[PDB]
């Protein structure tokens, strides 16, 4: 009696173990093909502006014409650069003309230590501002090349949002390629439903066996009726195994369809991959142009402050220069006259 119920639990455990084997095999095959093919419909996302880029566009509009004012400010900085260079050139011309006249004067006859020493300080101070100016020349030049490099995107990011979205590349798929996408998406849907019903059918079979072990064991008790009762339960198990076997057999036709669709998808796959590469490429130049905009605001301010301080010094040195050179010439006028 106790051995008949034990022989039936072994028969139930065996058929359940054969079931779990056929499922693991079919899943192993199925998983290898999915992993090997690597396979979606988020094509509308290309038509959207990423939220992080919209926050940057809105930042260029909280202050009206910030890109225009940055461009103008760069032109002002470029203006005071050439002004400094020209005043430094004026001081040079005065020192060169004075040194020429002094050589001619010392030849025509056989001076003043005070003006000579002031003229030497002007020369020293001039070369100081020449070294600082030429040092900041490469910096000023690179600042303007960077401005020119990014101003077109900064104008784009400042304009209306629809032109920003128009700068991004969109998919241009023919009706044939959409069909290849739809067919591929339809088969993948069938694969997932096959996976779901497989998990479901196995659970039902496991629960049918579990409920039979709660019933004809944990509460009730039989006698010689174990022969017919085991046939009743076994009929229920076999009907579910029929559905499960249909599910397993169906996998072979589905894999053939999926691998065939994957061959048609190969041209579309590369087109869409190049579109994603291009989309993130243009997006990153817009991000980089916004990053350069912050750095340009900072360095444009540093440059205008530097060259304003430097223009003031060079303008003041030009005053000392023309005063010293004029006085030194008046001295040569007086001396060479009384000769």
């Amino acid at each position: 009696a106790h051995e008949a119920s034990s022989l039936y639990s072994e028969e139930k455990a065996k058929l359940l173990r054969e079931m779990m084997a056929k499922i693991e095999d079919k899943n192993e095959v199925l998983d290898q093909f999915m992993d090997s093919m690597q396979l979606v419909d988020n094509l509308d996302a290309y038509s959207h502006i990423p939220p992080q880029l919209m926050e940057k566009c809105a930042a260029l509009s909280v202050r009206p014409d910030t890109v225009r004012n940055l461009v103008q400010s760069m032109q002002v900085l470029s203006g005071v650069f050439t002004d400094v260079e020209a005043s430094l050139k004026d001081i040079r011309d005065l020192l060169e003309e004075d040194e020429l006249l002094e050589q001619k004067f010392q030849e025509a006859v056989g001076i003043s230590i005070t003006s000579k020493a002031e003229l030497a300080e002007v020369r020293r101070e001039w070369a100081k501002y020449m070294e600082v100016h030429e040092k900041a020349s490469f910096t000023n030049s690179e600042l303007h090349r960077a401005m020119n490099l990014h101003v077109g995107n900064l104008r784009l990011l400042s304009g209306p949002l629809d032109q920003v979205r128009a700068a991004l590349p969109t998919p241009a798929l023919s009706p044939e390629d959409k069909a290849v996408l739809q067919n591929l998406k339809r088969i993948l849907a069938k694969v997932q439903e096959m996976r779901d019903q497989r998990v479901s059918l196995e659970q039902q079979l496991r629960e049918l066996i579990q409920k039979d072990d709660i019933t004809a064991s944990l509460v009730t008790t039989d006698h010689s009726e174990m022969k017919k009762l085991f046939e009743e339960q076994l009929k229920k198990y076999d009907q579910l195994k029929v559905y499960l076997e249909q599910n397993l057999a169906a996998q072979d036709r589905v894999l053939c369809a999926l691998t065939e669709a994957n061959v048609q998808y190969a041209a579309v796959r590369r087109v869409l991959s190049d579109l994603d590469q291009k989309w993130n490429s243009t997006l990153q130049t817009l991000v980089a142009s916004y990053e350069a905009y912050e750095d340009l605001m900072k360095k444009s301010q540093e440059g205008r402050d530097f060259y304003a301080d430097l223009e003031s010094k060079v303008a003041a040195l030009l005053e000392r220069t023309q005063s010293t050179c004029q006085a030194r010439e008046a001295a040569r006028q007086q001396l060479l006259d009384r000769e």
Binding site: V132, K135, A136, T139, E142, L143, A146, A292, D295, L296, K299, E302, G303, F306, D309, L310, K313
Partner: peptide, 10 residues
């Protein structure tokens, strides 16, 4: 690149 552009000190 342009972040490391420094103007001289006076």
């Amino acid at each position: 690149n342009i972040k490391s552009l420094s103007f001289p000190k006076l």
